[PDB]
Design a protein around this ligand. Sequence first.
Ligand code: HEM
Ligand SMILES: O=C(O)c1ccc(F)cc1
Ligand SMILES: [Cl-]
Length: 393
Amino acid sequence: TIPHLAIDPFSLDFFDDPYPDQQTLRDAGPVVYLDKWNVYGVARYAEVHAVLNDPTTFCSSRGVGLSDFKKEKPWRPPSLILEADPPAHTRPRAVLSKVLSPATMKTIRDGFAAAADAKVDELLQRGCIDAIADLAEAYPLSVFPDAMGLKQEGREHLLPYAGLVFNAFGPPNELRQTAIERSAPHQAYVNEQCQRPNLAPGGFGACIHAFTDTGEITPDEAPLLVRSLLSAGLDTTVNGIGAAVYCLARFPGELQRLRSDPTLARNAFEEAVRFESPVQTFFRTTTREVELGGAVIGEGEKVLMFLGSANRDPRRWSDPDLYDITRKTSGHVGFGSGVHMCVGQLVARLEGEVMLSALARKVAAIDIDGPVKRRFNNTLRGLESLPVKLTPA
Ligand code: HEM
Ligand SMILES: O=C(O)c1ccc(F)cc1
Ligand SMILES: [Cl-]
């Protein structure tokens, strides 16, 4: 009753062009079985959304990667928020929510926006640039580590550590094995910067340590919550901003619409998150026998959610393969859905919005003028290099 597919959604060929295989997954049925890794898969919007919104049945405390924490030791101490279920999840979530709250965005917006404008001005002086290294990477690196309160020394560890983290959610393939093999120096840096004395005052990190006296978290919980922001807060935005630039580069009609109304910047980034889904996948583990779209999944089974596929499901979206900066994007799962829905989505949108705003006001055309190279990662979708010529407005 449940179709079995040999598709490896973590192979390089899949990363190179996932969309045909994603339609195959959606159309095979609401619940598939991936023989390659012995996990269930859900690729339609309806089933992804249902699984995300039943944390009791599809839990996260046994890991949101392939590995089942009840069977294997996690490669690092479990995340106190990502890899926790209610009620243990509730109070750590509340703290990060306040640390990254609407009121906090107001304190950093002017600095984030100034840095966004300043980078686009700098890029326009060079003309031909790499929209990944020189923009998608350089901008988040110029605002986020500082907003965290990190010292200058050792920041080169941040992107490699993040790549390690997202590769580690994947199966024990060469991408994962090789990342873990090189991890030691990056883990040492990150763990050390999570200690209270190493986080500058007023930053995200210090604000986390400052919440240890409310009874929501204890002092020994703060370092791991800082580790969460250093895991999830940088590499995701690099791929989100790179996706937006890529879309604008591929769809000049939409760059022209954005230039004509720069207040479309925030939705243009949201549509970019739906269209490329930088975070492609996450796992859950069944805590009991469950019926999901006619399939009977037993207890203790891994369920792979195709977030990027759900965001392109024609059962949910009109013209899903078209980048539309005026699309009503509410409901996309690029940030997840439910109790675990990205707690840092206000930071991501702020970064994305003020960068697209700078582009909308300062750039007339974005033309690819070099070989595009993809960056392969078991969980993240994005580009290694995106040579573009920026024409000033
Ligand atoms: C384009 C940018 C981003 C994308 C696409 C993204 C994606 C996601 C997704 C899909 C989840 C759900 C995980 C799950 O359901 O198991 C999530 C959770 C999370 N994100 Fe983001 N993220 C982004 C940026 C950020 C930023 C900027 C931060 C912090 C500054 C952050 C921190 C977190 C944390 C801590 C969680 C765990 C929340 C929880 O378990 O309750 N992310 N993110
Ligand atoms: O360490 C965490 O808590 C975390 C890591 C990755 C991610 F996408 C979200 C949260
Ligand atoms: Cl670590």
